[PDB]
């Protein structure tokens, strides 16, 4: 039922009144709650999110880019417009179906971890197995690694892998299993 | 970066109470009938010590924070030690 995505709410007065919107979304969660149906939008700014009535008052949908590339729903209402800049297509389609049903009316935590981490020395903090699984960026420095470990090799989404000032004598072949690696420093 | 805190362990028993023991060794109070100016001198010395300890806060904010810190292990142990010998 609930949807996790970036959201951008645009009050439709702004363009004709000559005012320009932010141009990008904010990480959020959308909930289709219901005696009568509501849409709750919650962001970092508001755990206690904003409600929006949708019992009889959806204007229209946009669906040209529901494949989640340069995408949105651009859900217009009296008076606001709700854009969903990045989600996953299947859950978003189910959410849109539920929204349509709620508008027909007769029937019925945004947690995250950053890209980046740093080890300035192993004795301060070892890498261990407590890394995030989809980590994007790590520095290790002044550590006594003679050879690169599975601990950093198994990370599924690394853009940057830095081992500078470590003691590596040899590096593996399985370091090349990192699909999105763009920065490698030794 | 090391953002500082007025907490129980960074400075209150390091640049704080050990120096506060010494702040009034050379004070110049004059006793009964002069309580107003004696208090002014006392407040100036206490304020100066607090500023050199944690310069981020104003004096009353510092006081309201340190009164809360009075409940912590390190602070009361140092207080009893200062009461006893050194």
């Amino acid at each position: 039922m609930k949807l996790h995505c970036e959201v951008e709410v645009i009050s439709r007065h702004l363009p004709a009144l000559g005012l320009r919107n932010r141009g990008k979304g904010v990480r959020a969660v959308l909930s289709l709650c219901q005696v009568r149906a509501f849409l709750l939008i919650s962001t970092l700014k508001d755990k206690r999110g904003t409600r929006y009535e949708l019992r009889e008052n959806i204007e229209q949908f946009f669906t040209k880019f529901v494949d989640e590339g340069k995408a949105t729903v651009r859900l217009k209402e009296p008076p606001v417009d709700i854009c969903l800049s990045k989600a996953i297509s299947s859950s978003l389609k189910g959410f849109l179906s539920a929204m349509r049903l709620a508008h027909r009316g007769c029937n019925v935590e945004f947690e995250n971890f950053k890209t980046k981490m740093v080890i300035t020395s192993k004795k301060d903090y070892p890498l261990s197995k407590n890394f995030p699984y989809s980590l994007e960026h790590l520095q290790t420095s002044y550590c006594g690694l003679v050879r690169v470990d599975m601990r950093m090799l198994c990370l599924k989404s690394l853009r940057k892998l830095d081992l500078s000032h470590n003691h590596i004598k040899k590096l593996p072949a399985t370091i090349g299993d990192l699909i999105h690696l763009q920065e490698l420093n030794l | 970066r090391n953002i500082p805190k007025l907490d129980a362990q960074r400075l209150i028993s390091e640049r704080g109470l050990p120096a506060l023991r010494h702040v009034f060794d050379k004070a110049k109070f004059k006793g009964k009938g002069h309580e107003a100016e004696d208090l002014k001198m006392l407040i100036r010395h206490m304020e100066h010590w607090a500023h050199r300890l944690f310069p981020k806060l104003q004096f009353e904010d510092f006081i309201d924070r340190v009164e809360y810190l009075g409940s912590k292990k390190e602070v009361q142990t140092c207080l009893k030690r200062i009461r006893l010998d050194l």
Binding site: - | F29, K32, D38, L39, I43, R44, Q58, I63
Partner: protein
Amino acid sequence: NCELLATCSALGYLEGDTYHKEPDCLESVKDLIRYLRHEDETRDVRQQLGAAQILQSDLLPILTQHHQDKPLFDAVIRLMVNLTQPALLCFGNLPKEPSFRHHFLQVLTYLQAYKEAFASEKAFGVLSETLYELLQLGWEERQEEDNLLIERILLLVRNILHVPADLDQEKKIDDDASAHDQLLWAIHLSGLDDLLLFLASSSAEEQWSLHVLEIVSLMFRDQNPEQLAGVGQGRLAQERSADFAELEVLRQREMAEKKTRALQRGNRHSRFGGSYIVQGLKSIGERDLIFHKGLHNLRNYSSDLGKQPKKVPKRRQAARELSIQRRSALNVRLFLRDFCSEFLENCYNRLMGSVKDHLLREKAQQHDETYYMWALAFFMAFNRAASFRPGLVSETLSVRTFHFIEQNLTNYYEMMLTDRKEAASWARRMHLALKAYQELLATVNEMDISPDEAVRESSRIIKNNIFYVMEYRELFLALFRKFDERCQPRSFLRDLVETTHLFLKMLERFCRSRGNLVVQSEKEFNFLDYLKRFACSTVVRAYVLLLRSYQQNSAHTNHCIVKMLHRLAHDLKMEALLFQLSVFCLFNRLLSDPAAGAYKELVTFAKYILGKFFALAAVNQKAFVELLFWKNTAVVREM
């Protein structure tokens, strides 16, 4: 929207000053009631009818000019009760999110508009006339037809009186007719006030006692008993001269502060340079302080000259008093004084007995004892003010009322500590209970002063009972040891301190007059070991917290604070408890005050304790470290 517009049009139209109702008013009004009953949770029909202003444009003219048409009149009264339903009932609570709060504000705005419209004397005249010709019949002659009409009439009056003042138009200055003042004047001129007095005094119509109590509460919402009791014929000259004198006092204070600031800064412009090294003062490093803010500032140098204060985080933000006090219109004040006098003489005993019967039988809403305790506080204070006669309030002077108030206060205290999501509301209910308790404790003193040996006898009886039972003594310590500035306002702290002062005054005088040794399975007692329970750090912390506002405190409040601290210092020898750095900053402000001569008691007490501190400091330099923290039995180790 358009269908509502059609029915609203079908109600009829006004022409000059006469309303021409359509023959289908009955079915259109029933349709309006149906729409209101089938509202959305956002209360869309409420907002739309308020925007259309049909209450002001149709229903009031119909009510005032076609009151002989009884079915239409009944339907209009029911519709108006529905529309004037308060917003807190409409939404259940104050919404926590923007959309429902916007809808709440819309409904509240239209309620304020209805209150503005309802000040016309004609509407309340019709209401008083129909209520009068209804109540003319005997109780046994009434049926559901008339009893429900009395309920709806009194609920309409209750709803219109309940409405909060608009934040926009609550900026009225004193001695001016606010919307509430005009509404009370409408009640006065219509004579519904006399009907309320009749309903309160009637033994037969006791069934409406809770309703009448709520009407009287909302009527006397803004007033203060002693200030109201002081009203009389010669007040215009007194208040005019007082206004001129207070204006001059304010002006002189502002001039003095301006001169002090003009001396604190120099007589050179700010970009006039110059820098100094203060050789003795070490900087935050080891180097000498370089001072840039001008030579004039070094007379009263402080390191916080250029510092930004800190954002108090949301959790630690102190509670603030919910309203300013304004002196209402003199005509309304005279009317309310006369109402209060006649009500006290003719109605009060029977009404309070009836309300107590309702609370005992448990046929009252959840918090109606708050209205009961309000009435105790207000009317007993008014009685003691001006001609005190205990017969007028003798239904309240029983020990059972002390017990009831103590039980309610302890209940509110527990619920404030546990039900944390409306702790402020529980604090307000507890504040009402505290004021009622305070007024009972003041009334027994007035009974002692009064000449009748009978009331002196019963005063002795109730004093013996209260001082014997333990909870009345322990409740003050219980309140002090869990008071929180974060939750309870400074007005509550003032009332608690003054009530404690009065209670200890009575208890000390009682024990001084005679022994009366057994207390509480009894045990011995003495007031000194009772006072030693007030030697805790938390209570004196609260007392100095109240002392910080000595400039704004009343003189009696300052006397209460300084007398309690003098009792703890001079008579219990607990000066080391009050040797504190924050308290010394407050003393520094007291000594530096230009108006220090106006606070002779406070500065003398401050200099006494400061002299004791500096004697101890000369003997032992560790007292300077002892100033930095609150303490327990270091109060004796220092000694």
